[PDB]
Amino acid sequence: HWGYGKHNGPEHWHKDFPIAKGERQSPVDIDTHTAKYDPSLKPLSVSYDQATSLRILNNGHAFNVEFDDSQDKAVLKGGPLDGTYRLIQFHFHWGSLDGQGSEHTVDKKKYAAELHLVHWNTKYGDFGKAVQQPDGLAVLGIFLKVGSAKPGLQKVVDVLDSIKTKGKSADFTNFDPRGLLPESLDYWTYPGSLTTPPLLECVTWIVLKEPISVSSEQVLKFRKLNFNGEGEPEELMVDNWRPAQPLKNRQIKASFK
Ligand SMILES: Clc1ccccc1OCc1nnn[nH]1
Ligand SMILES: Clc1ccccc1OCc1nnn[nH]1
Numbered sequence: 001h002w003g004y005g006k007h008n009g010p011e012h013w014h015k016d017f018p019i020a021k022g023e024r025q026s027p028v029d030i031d032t033h034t035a036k037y038d039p040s041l042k043p044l045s046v047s048y049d050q051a052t053s054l055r056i057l058n059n060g061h062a063f064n065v066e067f068d069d070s071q072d073k074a075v076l077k078g079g080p081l082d083g084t085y086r087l088i089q090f091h092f093h094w095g096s097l098d099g100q101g102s103e104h105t106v107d108k109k110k111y112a113a114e115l116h117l118v119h120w121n122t123k124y125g126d127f128g129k130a131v132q133q134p135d136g137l138a139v140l141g142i143f144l145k146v147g148s149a150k151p152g153l154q155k156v157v158d159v160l161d162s163i164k165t166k167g168k169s170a171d172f173t174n175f176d177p178r179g180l181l182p183e184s185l186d187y188w189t190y191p192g193s194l195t196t197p198p199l200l201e202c203v204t205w206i207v208l209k210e211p212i213s214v215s216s217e218q219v220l221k222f223r224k225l226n227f228n229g230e231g232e233p234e235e236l237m238v239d240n241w242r243p244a245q246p247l248k249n250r251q252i253k254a255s256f257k
C-alpha cells in the first residue's frame, strides 16, 4: 500500500522497507561544485536502434513503457558500466507544478519531471536476479524542463488517455526511445538504489547533465493520469517523486570538465 500521499508516502516507507535508511539510497542532490571529473570513465554507449517497445502500463505509481528484453536489442554500455545492460522499461516522475517533480536535484534545483530508462546487467540472466546485485541495474536519468515541445514524447502523451487508471494498459509498439534523449550524453554517475519500494541498492545511476525540453501542454497531460483504479474516487497522478536522500559515503563523478 505504499504511495506518495501524506499517509503512505516516502516518510512512511522505512517501516516496511528499512533499507530506506540505508547507505546508498536514491535520489540525491548533485552538487555540481563537489562532483569530480573522472578522466577514466569510458565513453557512454546508448544503442537503441533495435529497441522493441511493447506496451504502456499505468501501474498505480507511474506509467511504464515496456520493451522486449529477451535478447540484446536496446542496450547501455560503457561509461562507468562493465558489461551489457538491457533496456526493460522507461517511466517518468513528475510534479503537480512545473517547479517540482524530479527525483534527482542539481544544486538543489528541482526539474518538472525526470525520465528513467531502466536497464539490467545481462550477466545475471534476468531482471529479478539482477535487482539482488550491487551492479545489477543501470538507470539513465534525464531531466525535463518546461519549454518547447519534445516531438519524440508526443506519441507517449497521446496514448495516456487510454491508460488513465491503475491496471490499464495499451499496445505501444514501434516507439523509438532515442527521441527522448538530449543532444549531449555528458553525465554524472554514482552508486544508488531504486527510488520506490523495495528500494534495493542495486543501481548504477547515470544522470545526464543536459535536460530535455517538453511543453507545458505535454506535462499537463501527465498530470491527468490517476493513481486510483477505475470506478474509484479520482486521485490525480502527481508528485510521484521521492525527495533527495543523504549522500553518505559516496562520491558523484562527472564525465565532463
Ligand atoms: Cl524490484 C523487483 C523486481 C523483480 C522481482 C522482484 C523485485 O523485488 C524483489 C524484492 N521485494 N522485496 N525485496 N526484494
Ligand atoms: Cl524498475 C522497478 C521494478 C520493481 C520495483 C521498482 C522498480 O523501479 C523503482 C524505481 N527506481 N527508480 N525509479 N523507479
Ligand SMILES: [Zn+2]
Pocket (backbone or CB within 6 Å): 091, 092, 093, 116, 195
Ligand atoms: Zn523512476
